[PDB]
Subunit: 333 residues, 4 copies
């Protein structure tokens, strides 16, 4: 594989169509899904030349750990849909690559099993029924050694995914929510989480500048600027289009991550140049999982690592910090 796009083709060959559609699709007319890619394609980087590149490093420190790349695996529910080893295959590959893995509330293997893989994992929270049960999930994750709580805040309910409706898609009986034997989150819920853990709380799905500022005020340690990969509000602005404004508004008060459409090391470089601390990558990780299980995900991460290093150095950046200081220009495509 020489690009992330090689893996999509390979996943399409192997997966049943309805599963590939669950993975690929967006809500509504898929306008936000397409705009995630359009928005990245319009961004051009202004590289710097003639800088010392004797020890180019792609590492970052985030949420108290060193990561090998400015990248984490995004929360994607029900990974046994894509391969029988599901979340364990992905978490092992992430660990070995030095990349954070986000364990999902709707994981198809229990959070404790995935955390046992090692690799200092993060945990993604959906707000439950009950303040008490939500807080018990958080405490489970913390007791298992998760290092951050990624509170997904863009899902008061699930978006209308027309491919899934047309397909009549539903979970095979062999895939379950392994953390179990939901209610809309508010700012009060965020406070309840923050008060119940010493881990950093990261709010995922922020797009409005004032919501970014309020996240800082609320004691978040990070946010993920995101339209949920075009799967929630159809017509929501891409996160990459809000990122620069959000980074300026928080003015270093929390880590600012982005996701949606990241498909190469060049894309990671664009996100960092716009001010991102790191990115999340969703669909490509699942394509690699579907195509070749753990070794697929390892090869994907390897490929991304090489593309990130290549892009950084071509742009004159010996560190991710330097990449954040790059300027950009909007083009037409």
């Amino acid at each position: 594989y020489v690009s992330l796009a090689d893996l999509e083709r390979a996943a399409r060959d192997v997966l049943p169509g309805e599963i590939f559609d669950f993975l690929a699709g967006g809500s509504g007319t898929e306008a936000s899904l397409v705009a995630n890619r359009t928005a990245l394609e319009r961004v051009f980087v202004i590289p710097r030349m003639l800088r010392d590149l004797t020890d180019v490093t792609t590492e970052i420190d985030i949420f108290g750990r060193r990561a090998a790349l400015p990248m984490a695996v995004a929360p994607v529910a029900y990974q046994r849909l894509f391969h029988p080893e599901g979340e364990l295959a992905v978490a092992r590959a992430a660990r070995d690559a030095g990349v954070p893995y986000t364990i999902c509330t709707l994981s198809s293997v229990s959070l404790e099993e995935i955390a046992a893989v090692g690799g200092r994992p993060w945990f993604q929270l959906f707000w439950l029924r009950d303040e008490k049960r939500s807080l018990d999930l958080v405490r489970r994750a913390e007791d298992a050694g998760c290092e951050a709580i990624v509170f997904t805040v863009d899902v008061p309910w699930m978006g209308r995914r027309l491919r899934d409706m047309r397909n009549g898609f539903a979970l095979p009986e062999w895939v379950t929510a392994a953390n179990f034997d939901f209610a809309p989150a508010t700012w009060e819920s965020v406070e309840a989480v923050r008060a119940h853990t010493d881990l950093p709380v990261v709010l995922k799905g922020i797009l409005a500048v004032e919501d970014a500022r309020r996240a800082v005020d609320a004691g978040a340690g990070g946010i993920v600027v995101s339209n949920h990969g075009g799967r929630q509000l159809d017509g929501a602005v891409p996160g990459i289009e809000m990122l620069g404004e959000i980074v300026a508004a928080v003015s270093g008060g929390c880590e600012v991550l982005v996701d949606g459409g990241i498909r190469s090391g060049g894309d990671v470089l664009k996100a960092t140049a716009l001010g991102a601390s790191a990115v999340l990558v969703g669909r490509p990780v699942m394509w690699a999982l579907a195509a070749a299980g753990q070794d697929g995900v390892r090869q994907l991460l390897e490929l991304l690592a090489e593309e990130v290093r290549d892009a950084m150095g071509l742009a004159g950046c010996e560190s991710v910090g330097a990449a954040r200081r790059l300027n950009t220009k909007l083009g037409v495509v």
Copy 2:
């Protein structure tokens, strides 16, 4: 049906081609028809997160009545072209959905019969021959219980609809103007209407900011910012592109509606975020009518209601007022 586009395909199957073209077409090169869609596709919403959604309501108060959605059925002449029950099928479905229905001057069932369906209907006026006859139509509508007069002001004469000319289209002898056994409107005509009724007068087809301001000065209770679905001046700006400027200029002095290209609840949300009080929907209502008569229109309204609620809540809006306070960003497509 899971999108409004399912119904277009179904209407194309059933209708004779020349009738489908009368419905679908625009004037000239159809540049304004296409731009109505392009303009909406370029608008992205910036959703808000973590707000209380315990009683999300899509209701609005407009022209003295509660409506179930920020939406009304647009005036479309000669609805028996599309189904034998024509206007009665549509008005019944609108009533049952709690959506205003606009009865047309060129309705193929008499205004009194349609008003008898109930549902507190509006009446669309074309200026006649004669100040006296125009005012008699208005008085008929008012006597029948219509609640607003939608004065169409963008038709000094009909636009050049090339599909209809190429087809040699004409009304089947079984479709007539049931209100009967036209001259260009001016501001004087508006005053004559305003002086002759206590109902709100809504001027439909306003695009210039100064015409919006003058509409307020003239005592209009509303305007519909509109290029007549691309059927009048070919090259007229889409209403959605003028809406924000117009809303700022009237500064609450009348209700500001918009139409042209509204094809989903997401589109309704975009219109409200740009400052619209409500939208009109034209062609999609007729597709549903053609496809399945009254029950078709009911299903369409049901679908739109669900899409509006879904979009609002995903955007953090518990009310239409809150949706009006959303910000937007123009993208490229």
Copy 3:
């Protein structure tokens, strides 16, 4: 015929391919040819409503004559290429429509014969060899009753027309320059013309704002803002994109015409809304000529007249002056 595009198809059927290409083509990669159309398609008009339209008139006064439309036939050399009656067929149709016809220096019928048709014609000048011979052409045109001298100033030499080169195109021996049995123009040449005639001198092919101002300073009675239909510099800006700036800079000091890509009455309305006094139309006139000779051109002019009236009134303009006061908005297509 219900659009100008019907006539192009009809001309393509009848003309030999190499002649159709001489007519259709542009220079270089035809980037300026395409941009003439793109530029018009991006312009949207903001129509006005509810104005008195009791005597809508499309007439203008220009260069001391009433014209029936804000339009003239552009100078197109060698019109016998397209029909055996050539320039006489076109000039007769123009006369009967009340539209100015521009007689070309490279006309395939002598200027005196064409002027004898009547209709108060204009004369287009190319600068010759010789100040003396150039001035003799001007005096011929004036003696024959031409009413303006359209000095083409964008042809120091002919552009590189790759269709013609690829075709090995050349004039059939039956088509000649009937005014005869060239050197680049300068501002000195303009002065020599201005000093030798009392007719208005109109400089055709101006695109720079400072050249428009200098044209006024030089005593021009008009300019034609033009990239020569994309046939001269490939990559020259479309005239329609310079028009508004030029109109503001001359501030009523001369008539400001535009050409390139005008294909409907809606396009004429856009040009006037951007500040044009009138337009020239080139290729469409030749399509009508090729398709049906004099009666073809009559039908074209009839069609354009109806489209101009239709567009004006739909836009709330009772006169061309009012159309010049319309505002516009740039869109995306």
Copy 4:
């Protein structure tokens, strides 16, 4: 041949596919390769009229020599890939056309042989292993009569060229680096070069404004604003999009060249209008070489010379200096 595009088709016919791909391709998704063309296509020139064109000249003085056109042949490694005479065929044609030829560090014929052709050549440097060996290449080039050192500064290492990876491309054993029997450059390397030669040092691959200013401060005699033909960082801004800003920032302190996508004399004119001293042309020279060897390159240069003269005069420019004073307008395509 009547356009540069005729030669691409001819090169595609003759070259083995993997060689054509080595020539045509870019890095990554080829976004920067495509953007080089898009960026030029968006630029329109505002031509001037009625200026004296009695002795239009396309000549410039650069780096102490007269050149016949504001153009040089770009450094392209391994030209024996394309024709058996390789660099000698191209250098001879360049000499005869009065165009500078850039001899490459990775030339497939030795720099001394190519310099012996005559035509006052330039030499392109890649930084070696060793300050000492790099400086020996420079001294060789100077001893052989090269007139400028084009220090390529955008290649700390080679970009990821996916066509080449997919093809498993490698140099045929009959093509070698004839200057031999690499380490990343820094500003210190530039200083080492500047101190070791009296020739002008030209830094090729600058895109950031501050790097342009620093190049002047460092004693460069020129820069080439360039993204390396889309072959280095994928997502690097096109040079043509940075050019105007860079020209203003250096304010005459060094020559400012540009490359990437120049495919006609019209494109050369656009580059000059944006402030370029001259352009480099890469791929088209190799297409002509592949198609017809030395005589191919001669015909290409002949064609470009005619297109440059044609464009200049159509734009009212008697000299390249005048072309630099032309204004431009960005369009949509």
